[PDB]
């Protein structure tokens, strides 16, 4: 069970022993940004709760040269020796420290090692990044990213989030660099040869994955929150101007969170820094949050309204973590939604509260619809499941841990109301401050809202409704997928019935009965009727139940405003009824009810519970619809049918769609200005509508956009393009070897990585194979087009008909190289796989992908995303074979 030199490596489990608890780490790191390596040492104060001959902790890719143990309490180890024998077992990323004399329960010891490695080459542990300056200089910084399991690549440590400790960090550096870390800098002291050495205030108790340090030459803007925290935004010096909005938003959010959670942020400073090469979107390292440049930086001339909205989100997301994750931390990675689900959910409360004009409230339903796909497949997973190897732990970061977790919290908040929800939250955070919780600690704390309360008879429903709350959500976390609520209206008697919603699996399928087996949700229902817009609430705990309506009514609309994580079906006239209402007077349904009805109709076609012609019937009212969320939801289905047709050659149906979209909706498309004027939905509407018109080669749209591009190129950036149409204008621009060349050159020179983002997109809507592969080759290189951007580039290329095949060929014929740059469980490889295959909709393509996935399990590689893809290409094939002629005739009928 053992190896390396020989010898029995004394520990066997992948998890660490719990006999040696860490308490304080003295960490000294000395990096050199010229030799691109580092030297380092640590002293770890541990407490032993059991007698042991050995200590076990993590360490990967680090060379260890000293190993001593000390104690002020165990004379045998009194200063300075002894020396420990060090035993390495890479397969478990562990090392063993072999103590000469079995240690003593309840006494403290001091472990000490010296370690060194090259600066990392990826996006892991202590790695190298580079940026360009305004003068075309290329500089180097060194930066940490640890989540989940890579602190162990920087320093040996008890590397599991339970082993919270205090950290005391010192860093050696040249005068041209600063050094940053979790905590403020107490001391710089100067040294012999002229080097400096920063001391940082000891951390509070905290998990290893959040420890951070950076050595760079960046610049900042600072400001102070209402409660005295110094917020600073760091970016490379030529981008200082782009940090203003981040400074403004962090202050108001950190304010908001202190008041909302009723718990001060504990450190004196909060730094946000924008790292040029950064794989995740951001990481919530306590006191030193790192960001993708596009998550943090903003610049009014090239960053759109959508951009701002994204930057605010990510900032609100990371600050939320300072309490959810850093303050209170998962016991282990199985319950990782405990922090990502909550940070995600809190983007909504905090951004709604601090920036209501961003209208983020209306964008939150998209987070939940986006996860209802995926979750309507059998390859889904529950929100908490066991996970033990590092890849599986990385795999826990997906739309389920984040989106779905945030969505069911929203459900529960709507049930208990905001006050009891906030109160529950505050108690969760206050109670596990500086330690760890699991699922059940949350549910207990969310249910519970001389003596504290007054005694009553009504008290029994306060102790029993509380127990209901806990019983409820354990079904939402331990069960994969989402419930279909099927309503039958006949009389003033409504029959209720829950199934597991399945897509590409119809009510009468040979595989349907098994997949439906043991599933049952405590679904907190809501609804309203045509009579009174008054919400009623009932809790369907059983596979069957019924309700009497206090009147007769035209229609019943379940799932008010879509606060609930379920789809609704109406048997009988229900669908005919509600659609009629939408056709005649649509404003007698609340806007979010509309968004939901549109959503659910199209989702139910997929499930075979409804014919496509009935969905397509509902979209007719969109000619009258001015609520942008519902109008854009609606359009999005028509726009995806088109691209799906376009992706096959099915050009008779595609051309009909193009005509129905430009004809119907011709008025709304035509009110659109090529400007940045109006509200945020106003501008979300404008970019959408114009993008659609130039995708469908509308002659006005293509000509306006093409003009702006010449005006722009022939002034070499002088006259300027309103942000909301920037991406359109550039991509129409890219349709010639001239524009595309110019744009590629503008990419290298630009200093808005949000502009770069729009340019590289535009560049991928070209039709020449040569251009698309060039984009990819560059992407591999990592010089022109950074490798952090490759996965999204392949995705953009594959999305479009001319690039479908190329992206596929490339992913297969270059798989080995792809993996040298990213971990198998990285969001990069997940997206590279998925983005190049999941839109495929034919028996042929399904075959090839089945083969390419098989081969990857010849070699040592398994991911869930394999089944999920195949289940999505299958879902697609059925959709076409079971709905396509209905779409063909509904258009033809319509042309008539």
């Amino acid at each position: 069970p053992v190896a390396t030199n020989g010898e029995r490596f004394p520990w066997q489990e992948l998890r660490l022993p719990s006999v040696v608890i860490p308490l304080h780490y003295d960490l000294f790191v000395h990096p050199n940004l010229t030799s691109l390596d580092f030297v380092a040492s640590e002293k770890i104060e541990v407490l032993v709760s059991n007698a042991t001959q050995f200590i076990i902790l993590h360490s990967k890719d680090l060379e260890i040269t000293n190993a001593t143990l000390q104690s002020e309490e165990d004379s045998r180890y009194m200063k300075p020796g002894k020396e420990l024998k060090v035993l390495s077992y890479p397969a478990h990323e562990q090392i063993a420290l072999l103590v000469p004399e079995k240690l003593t329960p309840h006494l403290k010891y001091y472990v000490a090692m010296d370690f060194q490695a090259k600066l990392g080459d990826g996006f892991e542990g202590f790695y190298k990044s580079t940026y360009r300056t305004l003068g075309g200089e290329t500089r180097i910084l060194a930066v940490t990213d640890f989540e989940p399991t890579q602190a162990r690549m920087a320093f040996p440590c008890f590397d599991e989030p339970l082993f919270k400790a205090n950290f005391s960090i010192k860093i050696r550096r040249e005068s041209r660099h600063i050094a940053l870390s979790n905590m403020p800098k107490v001391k710089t002291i100067e040294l012999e040869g002229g080097l400096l050495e920063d001391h940082f205030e000891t951390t509070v108790k905290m998990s290893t994955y959040l420890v951070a340090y950076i050595v760079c030459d960046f610049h900042s803007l600072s400001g102070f929150t209402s409660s005295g925290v110094k917020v600073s935004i760091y970016a490379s010096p030529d981008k200082r101007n782009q940090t203003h909005y981040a400074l403004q938003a962090s202050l108001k959010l950190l304010d908001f969170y202190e008041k909302y959670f009723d718990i001060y942020y504990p450190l004196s400073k909060l730094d946000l820094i924008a790292i040029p090469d950064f794989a995740p979107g951001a990481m919530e390292n306590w006191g030193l949050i790192t960001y993708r440049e596009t998550s943090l930086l903003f610049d009014p001339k090239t960053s759109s309204a959508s951009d701002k909205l994204w930057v605010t989100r990510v900032i609100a997301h990371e600050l939320a973590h300072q309490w959810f994750g850093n303050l209170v931390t998962m016991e282990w990675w199985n319950d990782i939604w405990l922090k990502e689900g909550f940070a995600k959910y809190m983007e909504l409360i905090a951004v709604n509260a601090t920036y209501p004009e961003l209208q983020f409230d209306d964008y939150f339903l998209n987070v939940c619809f986006e996860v209802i796909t995926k979750d309507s497949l059998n390859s889904s997973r529950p929100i908490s499941k066991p996970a033990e190897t590092p890849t599986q732990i990385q795999e826990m970061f997906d739309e389920v841990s984040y989106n779905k977790g945030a969505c069911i919290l929203n459900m529960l908040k709507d049930f208990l109301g905001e006050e009891k929800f906030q109160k529950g939250i505050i108690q969760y955070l206050k109670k596990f401050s500086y330690r760890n919780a699991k699922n059940d600690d949350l549910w207990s704390s969310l249910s519970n809202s001389h003596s504290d309360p007054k005694m009553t008879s009504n008290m029994l429903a306060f102790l029993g409704e509380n127990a209901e709350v806990k019983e409820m959500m354990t079904t939402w976390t331990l069960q994969k997928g989402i419930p279909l609520l099927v309503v039958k209206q006949d009389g003033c008697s409504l029959r209720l019935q829950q199934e597991r919603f399945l897509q590409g699996v119809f009510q009468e399928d040979p595989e349907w009965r098994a997949l439906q087996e043991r599933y049952l949700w405590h679904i907190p229902l809501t609804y309203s009727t045509s009579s009174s817009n008054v919400i009623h609430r009932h809790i369907l705990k059983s596979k069957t139940d019924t309700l009497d309506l206090p009147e007769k009514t035209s229609w019943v609309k379940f799932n008010v405003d879509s606060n609930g994580y379920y789809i609704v079906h109406y048997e009988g006239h229900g669908w005919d009824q509600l659609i009629t209402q939408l056709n005649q007077n649509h404003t007698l349904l609340r806007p979010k009810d509309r968004v939901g009805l549109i959503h659910d109709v199209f989702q139910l076609v997929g499930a075979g519970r409804l014919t496509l012609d009935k969905a397509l019937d509902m979209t007719y009212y969109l000619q009258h619809e001015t609520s942008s969320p519902a109008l854009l939801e609606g359009l999005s289905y028509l726009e995806s049918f088109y691209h799906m047709m376009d992706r096959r050659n099915i050009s008779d149906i595609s051309e009909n769609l193009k005509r129905y979209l430009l004809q119907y909706f011709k008025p709304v498309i035509d009110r659109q200005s090529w400007s940045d004027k109006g509200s945020v939905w106003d501008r979300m509407l404008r970019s959408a509508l114009l993008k659609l018109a130039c995708d469908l080669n509308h002659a006005p749209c293509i000509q306006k956009a093409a003009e702006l591009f010449s005006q722009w190129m022939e002034s070499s950036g002088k006259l300027n393009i309103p942000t909301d149409v920037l991406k359109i204008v550039y991509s129409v621009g890219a349709q010639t070897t001239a524009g595309w060349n110019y744009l590629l050159e503008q990419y290298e020179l630009s200093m808005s990585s949000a502009e770069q983002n729009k340019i590289l997109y535009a560049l991928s809507t070209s039709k020449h194979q040569e251009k698309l592969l060039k984009l990819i080759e560059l992407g591999m290189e990592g010089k022109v087009i950074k490798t952090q951007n490759l996965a999204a580039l392949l995705h953009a290329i594959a999305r479009r008909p001319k690039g479908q095949q190329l992206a596929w060929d490339f992913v297969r014929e270059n798989w080995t190289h792809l993996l040298k740059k990213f971990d198998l469980g990285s969001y990069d490889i997940r997206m590279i796989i998925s983005g190049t295959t999941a839109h495929f909709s034919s028996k042929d393509k399904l075959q090839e992908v089945k083969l390419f996935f098989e081969s990857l399990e010849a070699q040592g590689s398994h991911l869930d995303i394999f089944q999920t893809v195949l289940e999505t290409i299958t879902k697609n094939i059925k959709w076409l074979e079971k709905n396509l002629p209905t779409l063909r005739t509904w258009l033809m009928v319509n042309t008539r």
């Binding site: 995740p280 990481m283 993708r292 596009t294 994204w310 990502e340 984040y402 999204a792 969001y827």
Partner: peptide, 6 residues
């Protein structure tokens, strides 16, 4: 967390 990119 993230995670993602956009």
């Amino acid at each position: 967390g993230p995670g993602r990119a956009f």
